[PDB]
């Protein structure tokens, strides 16, 4: 189906405790495949998925140079932001950057991204046109003016349309055994007495990949949205994800309640009910 590649970067200053810590990770869909941490004893970008290990020394060498280069620009940018925002040099601040691409089943570009956030707030983002910017405030507007002057969007567009798409395609092929396999959820419903008058029915999905899934309860076929407790989808640690949805049900009414599961690894949505 459709697929994505993302690189995530975070720098956190720590005045009085050395230079900002820089951590970057790359993903294809929901699979981590590369990491770099500036606090690592001998920092290099390291593989985190088997299908990338085959890349050669020139690959790893350039990736590591880029990681170190980005770490440095983040450090300078963090100094710049203290100026732009009239802030003290005393406190810890955070710079985050994400970029990447989404491709359709045929591998053509669907959307590219390149966006930054300071202290958890939007700073500057490349628009969907890959040609113009959204600056969050008058500070980001300074960067916008510089980046418009240096035609930075053209450079990113070229990457996003070119290498991003082409290398994502490469990775999808090299890691076809896992990246192109959907593992459907294993599903079941459990029952948990609360009092004499009600019980919790909890609809489980376990062992699925990728992470996207819909778990719904209905009562008499009406969605129980406002009444369902939905936990965030959570990693199991073996590549797969878990999720559950729970409702509180009046005793005796359990059969009015149906759990509905949609996952790409399932041919048809499932309907479950509690089976005592």
């Amino acid at each position: 189906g459709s697929h994505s590649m993302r690189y995530f970067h975070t720098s956190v200053s720590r005045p009085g405790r050395g230079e900002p810590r820089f951590i970057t990770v790359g993903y294809v869909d929901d699979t981590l495949f590369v990491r770099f941490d500036s606090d690592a004893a001998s920092p290099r970008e390291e593989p985190r998925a088997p299908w990338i290990e085959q890349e050669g020394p020139e690959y790893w060498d350039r990736e590591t140079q880029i990681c170190k280069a980005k770490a440095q620009t983040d450090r300078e940018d963090l100094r710049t932001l203290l100026r732009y925002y009239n802030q003290s040099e005393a406190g810890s601040h955070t710079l985050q950057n994400m970029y990447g691409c989404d491709v359709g089943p045929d591998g053509r570009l669907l959307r590219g991204y390149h966006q930054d956030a300071y202290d958890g707030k939007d700073y500057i983002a490349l628009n969907e046109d890959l040609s113009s910017w959204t600056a969050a405030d008058t500070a980001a507007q300074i960067t916008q003016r510089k980046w418009e002057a240096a035609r930075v969007a053209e450079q990113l567009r070229a990457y996003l349309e070119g290498e991003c798409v082409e290398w994502l395609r490469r990775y999808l092929e090299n890691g076809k055994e896992t990246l192109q396999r959907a593992d459907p959820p294993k599903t079941h419903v459990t029952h948990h007495p609360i009092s004499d008058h009600e019980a919790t029915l909890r609809c489980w999905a376990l062992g699925f990949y990728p992470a996207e899934i819909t778990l719904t309860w209905q009562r008499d076929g009406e969605d129980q949205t406002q009444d369902t407790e939905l936990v965030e989808t959570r990693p199991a640690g073996d590549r797969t994800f878990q999720k559950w949805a729970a409702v509180v049900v009046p005793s005796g009414e359990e059969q009015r309640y149906t759990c509905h599961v949609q996952h790409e690894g399932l041919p048809k949505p499932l309907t479950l009910r509690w089976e005592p």
Partner: peptide, 9 residues
Amino acid sequence: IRAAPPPLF
């Protein structure tokens, strides 16, 4: 594969 870093802010 990664992109080259953009210019400073």
